[PDB]
Design a protein around this ligand. Structure first.
Ligand SMILES: Cc1ccc(OC[C@@H]2CCCN2C)cc1C(=O)N[C@H](C)c1cc(-c2cnn(C)c2)nc2ccccc12
Ligand SMILES: [Cl-]
Ligand SMILES: [Cl-]
Ligand SMILES: [Cl-]
Ligand SMILES: [Cl-]
Ligand SMILES: [Cl-]
Ligand SMILES: [Zn+2]
Ligand SMILES: [Zn+2]
Ligand SMILES: [Zn+2]
Ligand SMILES: [Zn+2]
Ligand SMILES: [Zn+2]
Length: 311
């Protein structure tokens, strides 16, 4: 008979006494140790005092599980623990003062998202996400990467899109303050104004240039081709996306960007960031140049309060 600690958040620890003849799953339900499914294993003696994650099976654990993760999905813990088993074996080197990921298990898109998050202002709503976000900025990003996979319903090895991953993550962040007022002008229908809030205020799909979005873009009207342009923008950042195309990035005009080379889904991501010069982060590899032209699909810009001067 050894004594262990059960938890769902690694904050509120619940003390439990176990028998070494019954498997952990027989006594606690699905039980994990550092991501490893210990349901069908029996209590060994090094397990004394260690803390185990358990699937919630009473109301106290169910409430604590939501407080930390903001989900009642019973599959979340297993998908989280399954991803953590891999991500804690990845390497997280510091590259140009940023935490990256050494290439493994098709994690190129995760590294790009991880690098981008360290350069934009964002507060996550689930304490689980915010706490691991902090530890990731400090170099320990294994837990943060596993959570990203779980929250995106993706598995280790699956092929991932950075824009899609950021969008999922943005929906779990406090972007209530973010506002985007747009104006569409049609030669016949007229002129109409719509205001966006939250995730749609900080993302646009169609062009990489924030300036071009300010000047206006050609979009079809409900009558059949108008023009939409940005009127007001109140967000700490914006994300501009377009299907991969050749694009020139100039030092000091953007924060960071996603480079995508190769076939749809089968390709590989690289990360470009603007510092004193242009830097390219490819997992553990770093290169720098003063100019850059290449296939870009996301560009991130800084923002605070913008109001247009078009009459
Ligand atoms: C790497 C990757 C993983 C997954 C993925 O999809 C997953 C699907 C998609 C829908 C929901 N999910 C389950 C996509 C890509 C991808 O290769 N992503 C790269 C940037 C990519 C994006 C787009 C695109 C996005 N929106 N639109 C209008 C066009 N077109 C591309 C054309 C050629 C080459 C790359 C393109
Ligand atoms: Cl409940
Ligand atoms: Cl209940
Ligand atoms: Cl959620
Ligand atoms: Cl890769
Ligand atoms: Cl979701
Ligand atoms: Zn309840
Ligand atoms: Zn792995
Ligand atoms: Zn969710
Ligand atoms: Zn019209
Ligand atoms: Zn890849």
């Amino acid at each position: 008979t050894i004594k262990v600690f059960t938890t769902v958040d690694n904050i509120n620890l619940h003390t439990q006494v176990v028998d070494m003849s019954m498997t952990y799953g027989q006594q606690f339900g699905p039980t994990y140790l550092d991501g490893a499914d210990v349901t069908k294993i029996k209590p060994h003696n090094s397990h004394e005092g260690k803390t185990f994650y358990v699937l919630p099976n009473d109301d106290t654990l169910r409430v604590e599980a939501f407080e930390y993760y903001h989900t009642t999905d019973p599959s979340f813990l297993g998908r989280y623990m399954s991803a953590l088993n891999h991500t804690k074996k990845w390497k997280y080197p510091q590259v140009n003062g940023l935490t990256s990921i050494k290439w493994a298990d098709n994690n190129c898109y995760l590294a790009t998202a991880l690098l981008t998050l360290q350069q934009i202002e964002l507060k996550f709503n689930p304490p689980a996400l915010q706490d691991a976000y902090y530890r990731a900025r400090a170099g320990e990003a294994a837990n943060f990467c596993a959570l990203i996979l779980a929250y995106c319903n993706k598995t280790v090895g699956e092929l991932g899109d950075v824009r899609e991953t950021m969008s999922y993550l943005f929906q779990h962040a406090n972007l209530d303050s973010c506002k985007r007022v747009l104006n569409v002008v049609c030669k016949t229908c007229g002129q109409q104004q719509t205001t966006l809030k939250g995730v749609e205020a900080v993302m646009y799909m169609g062009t990489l240039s924030y300036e071009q979005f300010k000047k206006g873009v050609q979009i079809p009207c409900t009558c059949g081709q108008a023009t939409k342009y940005l009127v007001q923008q109140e967000s700490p950042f914006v994300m501009m996306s377009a299907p991969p195309a050749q694009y020139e990035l100039k030092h000091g005009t953007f924060t960071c960007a996603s480079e995508y080379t190769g076939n749809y889904q089968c390709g590989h991501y690289k990360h470009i960031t603007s510092k004193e010069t242009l830097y390219c982060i490819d997992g553990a590899l770093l290169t720098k140049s003063s100019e850059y032209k290449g296939p870009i699909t996301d560009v991130f810009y800084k923002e605070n309060s913008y109001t247009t001067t078009i009459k």
